[PDB]
Amino acid sequence: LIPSTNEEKEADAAIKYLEENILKNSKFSELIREVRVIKDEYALIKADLYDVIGKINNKKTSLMENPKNNRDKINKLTQLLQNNLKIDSELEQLINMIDMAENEISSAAFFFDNAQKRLKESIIKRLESKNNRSYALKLSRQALSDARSALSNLESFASKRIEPMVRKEEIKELIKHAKTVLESL
Amino acid sequence: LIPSTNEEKEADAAIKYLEENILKNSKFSELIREVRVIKDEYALIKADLYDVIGKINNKKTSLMENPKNNRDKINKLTQLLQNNLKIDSELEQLINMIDMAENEISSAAFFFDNAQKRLKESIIKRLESKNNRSYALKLSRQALSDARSALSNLESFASKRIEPMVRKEEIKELIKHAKTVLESLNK
């Protein structure tokens, strides 16, 4: 199970290095909670901005059915509204930033996870080639052994048919000598 | 597909030794047939013997119910019967040598075909072990790569921590101010 090859060690070393001073200073669950707190905090800030923008617009609209008398008011309000669209715009960027961040840390846990799996899978395949190469050799030796048992069988066959091949006609005549002695008596 | 290792080579040579010197472009089946031909020849011969045993066991009981002095001309026929029964044995032996012969050539064929398959299996298995090793390397590299991806995100994440913790109070305050401006108009 231990990693052996230079590459297996090189991965193991990288994984254990994340594990034993990064993910033991600051673990994944507690990094995810970290961000989700501020993500929530920024959503309340958005909510509040949207509330005041709406109040700005609703006041401006009302004042606008009397725009001569409300010119100043309408101007402060127009300007004020335009300022908050800018605030909204910079807030969006930050909310984007915190979204990426939340993804990045969920990528990390993903990648880290997969990495551990990918190394387990590599060591297991190493052992599969080791077993396969070992079985090759043994196949090559069994093959040699079969060829020898084949040889030893072929020699046994060779020598067992000699007597029978050699005494056949000696026996054919030994019969059919004594046939003609049945003929005549 | 060609024998490379010393042990693949050594099995190659033991198979080809039989092909070249013992077998010589005459299948196992040919050797079987030749054994079968002589078992049939002996089959026939044992019939013939059995057949003229019967015929002695007549002219020894037949032509022996009118026998001009039975005791003497008995021996000659029992001598043959006995002289042609011991053979009936030597014959059974030879028939058995031929069956043992036929069984040997059966086992030869089994081991021979197995030598060939075992040898093909080993070459194939050897190549399989190297592909498995290629895949083990690819898998072990992808592990490093994944470990470095994970790093990249943890670095990237870490460099987004501070901008928002700083900027956020200032935004809270710009917001406080906006609603201050708006209340004030309403006076």
Author numbering:
A (entry chain A): 5 to 189
B (entry chain B): 5 to 191
What does the paper say about this structure?
We determined the crystal structure of a previously uncharacterized B. burgdorferi outer surface protein BBK01, known to belong to the paralogous gene family 12 (PFam12) as one of its five members. In a recent article studying the antigenicity and immunogenicity of PFam12 members, it was suggested to rename the proteins as family twelve lipoproteins (Ftl) FtlA (BBK01), FtlB (BBG01), FtlC (BBH37), and FtlD (BBJ08). Structural analysis of BBK01 revealed similarity to the coiled coil domain of structural maintenance of chromosomes (SMC) protein family members, while functional studies indicated that all PFam12 members are non-specific DNA-binding proteins. In the current study we focused on the paralogous gene family 12 (PFam12), which contains five members (BB0844, BBG01, BBH37, BBJ08, and BBK01) that do not demonstrate meaningful sequence identity with proteins from any other organism which would allow us to judge the functions of these proteins. It is known that PFam12 members are surface-exposed and highly immunogenic lipoproteins that are upregulated as the tick starts the blood meal.
